Structures are given as C-alpha cells and as structure tokens.
Design a binder for this molecule. Structure first.
Ligand SMILES: CCCCCCCCCCCCCCCCCC(=O)OC[C@H](COP(=O)([O-])OCC(O)COP(=O)([O-])OC[C@@H](COC(=O)CCCCCCCCCCCCCCCCC)OC(=O)CCCCCCCCCCCCCCCCC)OC(=O)CCCCCCCCCCCCCCCCC
Ligand SMILES: CCCCCCCCCCCCCCCCCC(=O)OC[C@H](COP(=O)([O-])OCC[N+](C)(C)C)OC(=O)CCCCCCCCCCCCCCCCC
Ligand SMILES: CCCCCCCCCCCCCCCCCC(=O)OC[C@H](COP(=O)([O-])OCC[N+](C)(C)C)OC(=O)CCCCCCCCCCCCCCCCC
Ligand SMILES: CCCCCCCCCCCCCCCCCC(=O)OC[C@H](COP(=O)(O)OCCN)OC(=O)CCCCCCCCCCCCCCCCC
Ligand SMILES: CCCCCCCCCCCCCCCCCC(=O)OC[C@H](COP(=O)(O)OCCN)OC(=O)CCCCCCCCCCCCCCCCC
Ligand code: HEC
Ligand code: HEM
Ligand code: HEM
Lengths: 74, 58, 52, 49, 241, 379, 75, 102
C-alpha cells in the first residue's frame, strides 16, 4: 500500500551520499550555524515577536491598573 | 598495531564484547559517579548535613 | 525427534558458536550481578568494595 | 529461486595496484530489492561467522 | 483591609538550588516546637522516628519519645491506658478534637503545622514574617479584644497571641535565644517538616544535572552521525532535452 | 524467511516503526507526538505505583498521600513526577495541537477528530485526578465546576445528582472519580492506537505542506534516534521540574485537608484548564458560559471546514501567520486572566480576549486565506 | 605508530579529563584553616633592608589575612 | 492597481518565501482531486521539473537552508504552468455537478 517501492514516480534524479563513518557529525558547527540562526530569526521575528510584545504590555498595564484599583483615593 | 585500531579490534568490533565493555563500564561508572557526586554534594553543604554534625551528639 | 542435527556440520556450527554464546553468558552474568547488587561476587572485586 | 526475487546476481573480485572492489551485483524488479540486500548481507555474515 | 502586605525574600541557607537544610537549625527548631508551639499546634503526620538520622540520634529520639505519654489500648479488660511512648509514635495532639481547640482558643482553630509552609504563599518567609511582624495596631482601625494586629496575616486579625520573645526557651547547645533566632530556627524546622525529602531531592537533582549534561551531547552526536549521512547529501537532475 | 516481514506480530511493528516511510524534512515539532505517547506510559506507570498505596476514602485520602510522601520509599518522587508529568503531558499536548493548526494537519479529518476525542478524554482524566488527593482545592474546584455543569434546565440537576452520587461532593464522588481516573488512560491508549492507525493510511505531513512522496526516508534509524533525543530532552525538563521546583506549577491551597466549610478566597483549576475558565466567566450567563466553553474546545473540531486557501501550510502565508501568532498570544492572555480574580480590569480584558479568540478562529483566518489567494493572482 | 590520532585520543581521554578531575578535586580541597598564632622567631619575618615598593614593609604579593608583618598581624 | 499593486505583488512574492526554495507558484498548491487530475494531465517534461523542484525544496527545508539569492525564482520569470490544466479540470467538474443538479 503505502510502502517503499510504489510511493511516487521520479525520473532523471541522481543522489550522492557519503558514509556517516567518514564525515564529521559537526562540520563547521559555529561558523555556519550562527549565520543560519540569525537568518532564520531575521525571517521569522517580525511575524512572531510583536504579539508577545503587546502581551507584555497588557500584562504590565493590567498589573499596574489592578494595584491602582486596590489603592484608595486620598 | 596502533592503540585505536586495537581498541576497536578487541573491544568494539564484536557485539558481545561491546556489551561486556558496556556492562563493566556501567559498574565502574556507577561507583566513580556516586563517589564524585556525593563528594560534590557534601562540599557544597559543608557543615550543614547530618554526617558533619553527627560526631557532636555521639 | 531432534535427530535432524546429528552430523559433522552441526558439530562444526556448535564449536563455532561456543565462544560467542559463552561471552553472551558472561555478559548476562555480569549484568545480573551488576543490576541485582549481589553480595557474593561484588565482595570479590577491589574497587566496587567501597560502600560495604 | 524459492522467493522469486532475482532476475540475476553475480559476485565479483576486481583488482588494481594495491586496491580493488569486492562484492556483488544483481538485477531484479523493484519489489524484491530490499529483501535481496538483506539476504545478500546475511550470506556475507555467514561467511564471516 | 483588602490589600495585603507581601513577605520579602529572606536569604535562607537552603534558598539555593543545591543548598540543603541546616540540620542544627532543624534540631533547635524542633526544640522550639516542643517547648512552645506544641501546646496549641499539632503535627499529626510527623513521628519521632523521622527525627532519627536528621537531627537526633537513635537513643536521643528514643528518650525524647519515652518522655511522652501515649494513650494505648484497648487493654485485655477493655479500656484505654496511659503508656510511655516509643519511636513509632507520632507527635501528640494538643486537643482530642478541633472543637475543643476552638473552645480553648477563642473560637479560632490553630492549624496543623505539618504542611504549613507548603500551604502558604511565601512559606518559611511567611512564617518568619508572621512571627516577627507583630506590632501595635495603627490608628483608624480598632480591633476586637483578644485579637492581635499582624500585617502579614490575611485580614490583619490573628487569634494567636505572640509566642516569641527573647529567652522564651533555652538552647542546650549554647545559642542566644533571641526573637529572630528562635523564629528562624522554627521556620527551618517547619520547612523540614513539610519536606523531609528536601536534601535527598537536591542530591538526586545534582546527579540528574551531571548525568544529563553528560548524556545530551552524546545522544545529540549520535543523532548528528545517523543524520549526517543525509545532511551532506547532494541531488542532481538529468533532463534529456 | 525473515521474521520482520512475515511474522504476524513483527509485521505490525515493521509497518509502523521500522520500514515506515516518513518525510525527510519534518522538524522537531513532530517529535512532540511521540513524546505524548511516552508521557502516557510514564503517567500510567507512575499512576500504578500511586495506586498500590492510595486509599479512596474521604477520611484516609489526604493521610494516604502524606504516607506516600513521608513513609513510602521514594514515594515523594513518584507522586511529584505524576503531577509534573501531567503538566508536561499538557505542554506536549498543546504544542501537538499547535503543530496541527499551523502546518495544516487538520485535513486528515479522521485523525483530527480522534485527536479531539483524545483531548476530551485527557482533560476529564486530569480533572478527576486533581480531585483525587482530596485537599481544599480539589474539593472546591470539583464543587464549583460540577455545580456550573448543572446549569442546564430540567436536565442538569438530575445529572449533577447522578454524578455526585448524593447531595454534594462526598465519598461516593471520590471513589467513583478514583475508578474513572484509573480506567480512562486505557481508553486513551486504545484511542491513541486508533489515532496512529488513521494516520498511517496517508503518512505524515511536512512543514512545507507539499507532497513528500518524492523524498521519504525510513523511520529507522533516523526518527528513532530523533525521538530518543526528544525523549531525553523531555526527561531533562521533567526531572528539573520535579527535583528542583516540585510545586512551582502547583497550588499551595491543595496542601490543607478538605474542610467543606472553608471556602478559599480564590478558587482556580490547574493552569492547563485556566484559559477555558477565562472563557467560562467571560459571559454573565451560566448556560452561555458552559456552552461557550464547549465551543471553545470544539472549535478545533470545526477547524477543518474553515480552510479556504489553495495552499495547506502557513509557511507561505505571512498574514495568516500573523493571525495565528495573535491567536497564540490571546490564548496566553486568557490563561493569565483565568489565573486572575474577577475584578477590574480583568473582566473587560477577558471579554475582549474571548471575543477576539472566537473572531480570529471563526472569521479572520478564512478572510486572510482568501485575501492571500487573491494576492497570489489565483482567485 | 606514525599517527597524530593516538596523541589526539590521549589528550581527549587522559589529559583534559585528568586536569578537569584534579580541578574539581582541588575545589573540594578549597578549604583553608585559621591563621597560626603569631610567634616572632628571628629566623623569619626579617628586614635587612626596607622594601623598594610602596610602604617598604609589604611584599609584592602580600595578602593581609595569611601573611604577617614583623610588627604583627594587621586587621 | 498600476503603481503599487504590482509592487505590492512583488513584495508579497518576496515575503511569502517559496521563491527562495526554488519553487514556482503552482508547486505550492495543495492537492485535491482537481489538482491531482491536473498534475496527472501534465506532460512528462513539466512533471519531472515539478517533482525535482519539490524534492529540492524538501532537501533545502531539511537542512534549514535556502537557495542563493541569484537562484531565487524571479517574480516575472515565474510561469503559471499548471493553471490552464487546473482550470479545465475545474470547468469539467462544474459541468458534471450542474448536470447532476438537474
Ligand atoms: C548555541 C551555539 C551554537 C549554535 O547556535 O548552533 C547553531 C545550530 C543551528 O544551526 P543549523 O546548521 O541549522 O543546525 C541544525 C541542524 O540543521 C539540525 O539539527 P537540529 O537542531 O534539528 O537537532 C535536532 C533537534 C531535535 O530536538 C528535539 O527533538 C526536541 C524535542 C523536545 C523539545 C522540548 C519539549 C518540551 C518543551 C517544553 C516547553 O535538536 C534541537 O533542536 C536541539 C538539541 C539540543 C541537544 C543538546 C545540545 C547540547 O543550533 C542548533 O543546532 C541548536 C542546538 C544547540 C543550541
Ligand atoms: C539509548 C542509547 C543506546 C541505544 C541503543 C544502542 O545504540 O545500542 C548500541 C548497539 C547498537 O548501536 P550501533 O548502531 O552503534 O551498533 C554498534 C555496532 N557494533 C556492535 C558493531 C559496535 O546495540 C548493542 O550493542 C546491543 C544492545 C545492548 C548493549 C549492551 C548492554 C549491556 C548491559 C546489559 C544489562
Ligand atoms: C623521586 C620519586 C618519583 C616518583 C614518586 C612516585 C610516588 C609519588 C607520590 C604519589 C602520590 C602519593 C599520594 C597519592 C594518594 C593520596 C590519597 C589521599 O589522600 O586521598 C584522599 C584525597 C581526598 O579525597 P576526596 O574525597 O576529597 O577526593 C575526591 C574524590 N572524587 C574524585 C571521587 C570526587 O584524595 C586525593 O588526594 C585524590 C587524588 C586524585 C588525583 C591523583 C592524580 C591524578 C592524575 C594527575 C596527572 C594526570 C596527567 C595526565
Ligand atoms: C516560539 C517559536 C516560534 C518559531 O520558531 O516560529 C517559527 C516557526 C515557523 O517557521 P516555518 O514557517 O515553518 O519556517 C521554517 C524556517 N523558519 O514557527 C513554528 O514552527 C510554530 C508552529 C506552531 C507550533 C507552536 C504552537 C504553540 C502553541 C499553540 C497553542 C494553540 C493550539 C490550539 C489550542 C486550542
Ligand atoms: C509593509 C511592512 C513592511 C515591514 C518592513 C520591515 C523591515 C524590512 C527590512 C528589514 C528586514 C526585517 C525582517 C523581514 C521579515 C519578513 C518580511 C517583513 O518585514 O514582513 C512584515 C511582516 C509580515 O508581512 P505582512 O504579512 O505583509 O504584514 C501585514 C501586517 N499585518 O509584518 C509585520 O512585521 C507586521 C506585524 C504587525 C502585527 C501587529 C499585531 C497587533 C495586534 C496584536 C494583538 C494581540 C492580542 C491582544 C489582546 C486581545 C484582547 C484584548
Ligand atoms: C497557643 C497560644 C498557640 C501557640 C503557643 C502557637 N500558636 Fe500558632 N496559632 C494559634 C491559633 C489560635 C492560630 C489561628 C490564628 C487565627 O487567627 O486563626 C494560630 C495560627 C498559626 C499559623 C497559621 C497562620 C495562617 O495565616 O494560617 C501559623 C503558621 C502559626 N500559628 C505558627 C506558630 C508557631 C511556629 C508557633 C510556635 C512558636 C505557634 N504558632 C505557637 C495558637 C498558637
Ligand atoms: C492523547 C494525546 C495524543 C497522542 C498520544 C497523540 C499521538 C500521536 C502520534 C503518535 C502521532 C504521530 C507522530 C506525529 O506525527 O507527531 C500523532 C500525529 C497527529 N496527531 Fe496526535 N496525539 C495526541 C493528541 C492529538 C490531538 C489532541 C490532536 C488534534 C488536535 C492530534 C492530531 C494529530 C495529527 C493531525 C497528527 C498528524 C501529524 C501530521 O502529519 O502533521 N493529536 N499523534
Ligand atoms: C491509569 C493511569 C493512572 C492512574 C492509576 C492514576 C492514579 C492516580 C492517583 C492514585 C492519584 C492520586 C495520588 C496523588 O495525588 O499523588 C493521581 C493523581 C493525579 N493524576 Fe493520575 N493516574 C493515572 C493517569 C493519569 C493521567 C494520564 C493523568 C494526566 C491527564 C493524570 C493526572 C493526575 C493528576 C493531575 C493528579 C493530581 C496530582 C496532585 O496530587 O496534585 N493521571 N493519579
């Protein structure tokens, strides 16, 4: 059914692979990892962050308004 | 004849010898790790644990 | 009814598989005495005799 | 033959100056391929053990 | 008063992640509880055998339990009878039932103190601020007689008379029994009473942290190996045109 | 010849975990699904070792739990990993549902519906388990939420007398809640088997949302060791949450004995219910609040019919990504508001939060989908 | 064996774990007892010349809690 | 519509981000019966190009990488290869549905 052997139909594609026993598991870890982390967060930060920024704003304003409301009126 | 070749050959190459290596290393790691973590814990809590003040009350 | 394995080839297979099965039995015995903390063998060993 | 896996298989030893390729080569249909690899490797391990 | 003062953070000896309790302070706090706090408060879930190996030795806790009468029974003739205590006995209740405790304490019920730093927001900080925060009531508010003003009690009206002052008891090890020292010792003992497993938990956590810091890069390395067969893979395309 | 493909018991394991084709590009989020299964086993195992000492009686339930902590060997360890494993179970469950929403995994409608059945079952199981230790918060939370479940006219009062087994929460309720709390994880395990069975007819989804049949890899050894690494990371988080902060997520008011005449100043459920609680009290009508809680949890079931884009994942939809993260932010605000008392300004914030939650799920996301469809010159 | 790899293994197994173990062990040993009683023998704490830096009686790496002065300890 | 809508279309094409995986627009369409039939009706050259682009995108999203900026699919050079086939399949399905109505 959904086993290997009849999943799709691919023609004219060549793939090259190495052994895991003769290539490094951490090939240029920091020197190529830090720029891709900055690239990924630069691609996603303007979609993710400002809702949580306004969450922090509402949280602080609600705490301040609650402590003001418990405070009496001289 | 080099040391990593013989360490692979007589310890890592056979799977039963691999498991014997893992079991003996597990026993020695238990003893050494228990000693090290106990020593770290008694040094961080120097004079606070009961065994540090057990001698005062015989 | 186990008369199918009476020949030189199965004896050859047997003497091939003596050391591997013996080493697996050694692994099983060491793992059993390691997991159970059995006091018969663990008193015969130098470094592990520290908590007794 | 019993499992109707292969169309053909063939072992080889190929030698050049202090190097060479030692192994097997088979042609079969798609649905058999994985099984035969297992069987082929098992045969090698039998010769190893 | 609806607004409530919060207790501050005191720099306890066991405040840190790997710092255990001070067992000498547990011993002194148990002496404080036995001499002072056991008259009105109960610790039904703690026994005399729990003190062995923590702050008292075997014969010490045996004598300290033997100096307590425990109502054993029923007898062969069919009655209750007083007996000297033993190590398997729990701490004795001050009252046989909560309503007698209410009758002896102006209606208010003194709570059981086995979990009282696990049942309050602040814990031992709250207990220290309650015991050391007694003061005369401010103006405007005029509370009822037999109540006491405590800004840390929620509602600021406690039915407990202040039990702590300088030299309310003695210390066998030679410690100045001040107000703050006695309150600190009894707060340490109450933290031990709520969590008798605290030091063993922190030791097991230290072993957990070291073992996980060993195990995580190795398992990550195994993942990077068995996936680095795929992450260096290159694909090509051969269109026939 | 081989037992992996011909033996009828090993054939199932090979078809589900060994030679199963999986997408080659799925991120760490997919590991959460296997983590959920592991949490289930952990809970079940730890639950069994709580059941060897727990006594379901109102006189001796709190005392039995204290005896587990103080006298049973390592019993404090088992109790606190059961509690924090329930919390970790709900964390992994929430991230599993968020993965389902973001990457368009609700188009597997049968898998999605067996999922929301599983979610209902685990919420009820955690509810009755929290009633079980019989503290102040257990008794009062059970009384509050079951009494508001009684709000249906002519039907709800007989149902609440039948659920309680008496006039209010008593020993019959505690014992039947123990029986239900024990037996519900096995229906949960069987439903997870059906969940996986309904998944495996079509295969997993990938973050791009495309047909991954052009590039698929076996589950072994790749996702085997990936899920092992996820299990190790989860056990780091769980054992840090037990051995260092055992009651940071807990509530201290559950450590007093259940006094039926001691109403606490605040009454809350656990944190993983709290958002629905803040949708509960956002409407000043009891039928409206209970039915709105039902819609707030069944809008996940309504979700596969609210999909309008010709794409599937949100990876190439930035506006709907923004609306999704506003929805997650709103859910966080709802959790904080449900933690808070019913005063100013929490009532208006909770009302606007629930209104925006239902508006974002129901209205704004199909509008954003059709806007992006028109924006990509296909509609 | 004509290889750098045995020295790489010997660094990463014997050398660096050994120095880490003795560093942690010295952190276990990092407890110093209280100062000795100031007894002024004439064969030490000598001053045949005032010192060439600063006060003339303080050494280069002087520490006021363990190192005495010929007048005595200082607080 | 003249000045910035085309500019906003270019900016949205850059912002959506399937161009930096080398994908075209019609590669990103989620399959239905209509899309699967339209893919089945494609000729061999466009089918093979589509499947290579899809598995290249899956390779790139495995390693959390993107193509170099010169290999990003250009907005003007993006061809809508599938949508006549998809429109024909949608039209004949609508014909079948309106016949089944009456
Ligand atoms: C830090 C400095 C180094 C750095 O930035 O490296 C860049 C590097 C990213 O560069 P990259 O080239 O994209 O490498 C990622 C690989 O493509 C693919 O590698 P990967 O990141 O997909 O690895 C698999 C993934 C698998 O993660 C999981 O399965 C996690 C699942 C459980 C999550 C938590 C559950 C509970 C949540 C409660 C809230 O692991 C992780 O996400 C982190 C594993 C950390 C293991 C311990 C390392 C010490 O960072 C990492 O790999 C992150 C891990 C280190 C931090
Ligand atoms: C969790 C981490 C380990 C996961 C399994 C694993 O990698 O096993 C190692 C390997 C497989 O990992 P592997 O894929 O690296 O294979 C190693 C290859 N040889 C054997 C040639 C070196 O499995 C075993 O060795 C068998 C399992 C038993 C290991 C020994 C147990 C001894 C103690 C018994 C009590
Ligand atoms: C001219 C002669 C030349 C040759 C002379 C040969 C002999 C010289 C003397 C050798 C040392 C003699 C004493 C050693 C034993 C001390 C025992 C003792 O006090 O133990 C309790 C003390 C205190 O006990 P502890 O409990 O604080 O120790 C911590 C224990 N663990 C590690 C489990 C946490 O322990 C030690 O002193 C242990 C010392 C360990 C380190 C030893 C050296 C390690 C290797 C260093 C070189 C690495 C190169 C790469
Ligand atoms: C916080 C982490 C945010 C984050 O990492 O966001 C980025 C990622 C989206 O990335 P993606 O578009 O897949 O592109 C891959 C390369 N960037 O974002 C994701 O992958 C996030 C996908 C969703 C998973 C998080 C779910 C959060 C909880 C949802 C709760 C609500 C669920 C329904 C409840 C009812
Ligand atoms: C035209 C925009 C141009 C932006 C240029 C930025 C600088 C570009 C040059 C530097 C590169 C920076 C990194 C680039 C990231 C990807 C591209 C980008 O900038 O995208 C902009 C991003 C997504 O773009 P798009 O979806 O078109 O925006 C619609 C706006 N809603 O959109 C955004 O970032 C805007 C997100 C706004 C979100 C506002 C949410 C407000 C409401 C939150 C409510 C939360 C709940 C509150 C409680 C409710 C109940 C009381
Ligand atoms: C008899 C005079 C008592 C003495 C001796 C001690 N306590 Fe007490 N305590 C008593 C009463 C009647 C009450 C109830 C107060 C009320 O108004 O309801 C209490 C209460 C406490 C509490 C709980 C406070 C809370 O906010 O819940 C604590 C933590 C407490 N008491 C501590 C405590 C300690 C440590 C004592 C020994 C020094 C002690 N109390 C003695 C009555 C009496
Ligand atoms: C009881 C808790 C649950 C368990 C044990 C569970 C188990 C699993 C498992 C093992 C998988 C396969 C691994 C994976 O892809 O992550 C999976 C996938 C999935 N589950 Fe669950 N699940 C649970 C809750 C839910 C819920 C509540 C939903 C519905 C919101 C859901 C919907 C899905 C979907 C849609 C997938 C497909 C993943 C994809 O292809 O994208 N699950 N689940
Ligand atoms: C068949 C498996 C299970 C059994 C036998 C079981 C049994 C128990 C028992 C006896 C208790 C009371 C003991 C105590 O409170 O420490 C308990 C508590 C609890 N259980 Fe379970 N449980 C099981 C599965 C689960 C699952 C799957 C969840 C998560 C949904 C869960 C969540 C809880 C919670 C939250 C508590 C309260 C913890 C607390 O005291 O704060 N249980 N369970």
């Amino acid at each position: 059914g959904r086993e290997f052997g009849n999943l799709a139909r691919i023609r004219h594609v060549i793939s090259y692979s190495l052994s895991p026993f003769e290539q490094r598991a951490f090939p240029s870890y920091f020197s190529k990892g830090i720029p891709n982390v900055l690239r990924r967060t630069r691609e996603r930060i303007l979609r993710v962050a400002p809702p949580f920024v306004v969450v922090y704003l509402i949280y602080t304003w609600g705490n301040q308004e609650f402590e003001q409301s418990k405070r009496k009126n001289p | 004849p080099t040391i990593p070749s013989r360490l692979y050959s007589l310890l890592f190459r056979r799977t039963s010898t691999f498991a014997l290596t893992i079991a003996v290393g597990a026993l020695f790691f238990e003893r050494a790790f228990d000693q090290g973590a106990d020593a770290i814990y008694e040094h961080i809590n120097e004079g606070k644990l009961w065994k540090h003040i057990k001698h005062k009350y015989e | 009814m186990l008369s199918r394995f009476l020949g030189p080839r199965y004896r050859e297979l047997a003497r091939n598989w003596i050391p591997t099965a013996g080493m697996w039995g050694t692994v099983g015995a060491v793992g059993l005495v390691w997991a159970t903390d059995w006091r018969l063998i663990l008193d015969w060993v130098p470094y592990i005799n520290g908590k007794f | 033959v019993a499992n109707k896996l292969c169309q053909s298989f063939q072992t080889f030893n190929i030698s050049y100056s202090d190097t060479g390729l030692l192994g097997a080569h088979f042609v079969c249909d798609a649905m058999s391929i994985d099984d035969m690899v297992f069987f082929l490797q098992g045969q090698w391990m039998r010769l190893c053990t | 008063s609806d607004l409530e003062l919060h207790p501050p953070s005191y720099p306890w000896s066991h405040r840190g992640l790997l710092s255990s309790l001070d067992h000498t302070s547990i011993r002194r706090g148990f002496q404080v509880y036995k001499q002072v706090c056991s008259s009105c408060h109960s610790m039904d879930y703690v026994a005399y055998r729990h003190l062995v190996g923590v702050c008292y030795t075997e014969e010490e806790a045996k004598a300290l339990a033997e100096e307590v009468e425990v109502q054993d029974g029923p007898n062969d003739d069919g009655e209750m009878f007083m007996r000297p205590g033993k190590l398997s006995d729990y701490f004795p209740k001050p009252y046989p039932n909560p309503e007698a405790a209410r009758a002896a304490n102006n209606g208010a019920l003194p709570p059981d103190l086995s979990y009282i730093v696990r049942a309050r927001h602040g814990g031992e900080d709250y207990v220290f601020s309650l015991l050391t925060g007694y003061c005369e009531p401010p103006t405007g508010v005029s509370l009822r007689e037999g109540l006491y003003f405590n800004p840390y009690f929620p509602g600021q009206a406690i039915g407990m008379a202040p039990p702590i002052y300088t030299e309310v008891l003695e210390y066998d090890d030679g410690t100045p029994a001040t107000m703050s020292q006695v309150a600190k010792d009894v707060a340490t003992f109450l933290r031990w009473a709520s969590e008798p497993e605290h030091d063993h938990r922190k030791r097991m956590g230290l072993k957990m942290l070291l073992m996980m810091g060993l195990l995580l890069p190795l398992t990550y390395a195994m993942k990077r190996h068995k996936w680095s067969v795929l992450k260096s893979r290159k694909l090509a395309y051969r269109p026939p045109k | 010849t081989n037992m992996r493909k011909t033996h009828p018991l090993f054939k199932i394991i090979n078809h589900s975990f060994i030679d199963l084709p999986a997408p080659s590009n799925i991120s760490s989020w997919w590991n959460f699904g296997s983590l959920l299964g592991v949490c289930l086993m952990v809970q079940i195992i730890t639950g069994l070792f709580l059941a060897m000492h727990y006594t379901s009686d109102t006189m001796t339930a709190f005392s039995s739990v204290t005896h587990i902590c103080r006298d049973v060997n390592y019993g404090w360890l088992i109790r606190y990993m059961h509690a924090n494993g329930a919390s970790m179970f709900f964390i992994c469950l929430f991230l599993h549902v968020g993965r389902g929403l973001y990457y368009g995994s609700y188009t597997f409608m049968e898998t999605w519906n067996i999922g929301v059945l599983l979610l209902f079952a685990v919420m009820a199981t955690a509810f009755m388990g929290y009633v079980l230790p019989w503290g102040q918060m257990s008794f009062w939370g059970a009384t509050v939420i079951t009494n508001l479940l009684s709000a249906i006219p002519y039907i709800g009062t007989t149902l609440v007398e039948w659920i309680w087994g008496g006039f209010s929460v008593d020993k019959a309720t505690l014992t039947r809640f123990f029986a239900f709390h024990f037996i519900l994880p096995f229906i949960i395990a069987a439903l997870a088997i059906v969940h996986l069975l309904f998944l495996h007819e079509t295969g997993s989804n990938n973050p791009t949302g495309l047909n991954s049949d052009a590039d698929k890899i076996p589950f072994h050894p790749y996702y085997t060791i990936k899920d092992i690494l996820g299990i190790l990371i989860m056990f780091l988080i769980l054992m840090t949450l037990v051995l260092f902060f055992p009651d940071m997520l807990g509530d201290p008011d559950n450590y007093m004995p259940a006094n039926p005449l001691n109403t606490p100043p605040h009454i809350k459920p656990e944190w993983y219910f709290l958002f629905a609680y803040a949708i509960l009290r956002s409407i000043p009508n009891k039928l409206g609040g209970v039915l709105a809680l039902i819609l707030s949890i069944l809008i996940l079931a309504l979700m596969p019919f609210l999909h309008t884009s010709k794409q599937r994942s949100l990876m190439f939809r930035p506006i709907t990504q923004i609306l999704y993260w506003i929805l997650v932010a709103n859910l966080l605000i709802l959790t904080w508001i449900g933690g808070q008392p019913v005063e100013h300004p929490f009532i208006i914030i909770g009302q606007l939060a629930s209104i925006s939650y239902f508006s974002i799920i129901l209205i704004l996301m199909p509008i954003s989908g059709i806007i992006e469809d028109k924006m990509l010159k296909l509609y | 064996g004509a290889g750098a790899n045995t020295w790489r293994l010997l660094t990463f197994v014997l050398a660096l774990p050994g120095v880490a173990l003795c560093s942690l062990n010295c952190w276990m040993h990092a407890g110093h007892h209280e100062r000795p009683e100031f007894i002024p023998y004439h064969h030490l704490r000598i001053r045949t010349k005032p010192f060439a830096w600063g006060d003339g009686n303080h050494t280069l790496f002087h520490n006021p809690h363990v190192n005495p002065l010929p007048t005595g300890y200082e607080h | 519509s003249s000045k910035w809508l085309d500019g906003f279309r270019k900016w949205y094409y850059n912002a959506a981000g399937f161009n930096k995986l080398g994908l075209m627009r019609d590669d990103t369409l989620h399959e239905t019966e209509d899309v699967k039939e339209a893919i089945r009706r494609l000729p061999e050259d466009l089918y093979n190009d589509r499947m290579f682009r899809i598995k290249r995108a899956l390779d790139l999203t495995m390693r959390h990488q993107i193509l170099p900026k010169d290999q990003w699919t250009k907005y003007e050079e993006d061809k809508f290869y599938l949508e006549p086939y998809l429109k024909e399949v949608i039209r004949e399905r609508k014909e079948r549905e309106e016949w089944a109505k009456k």
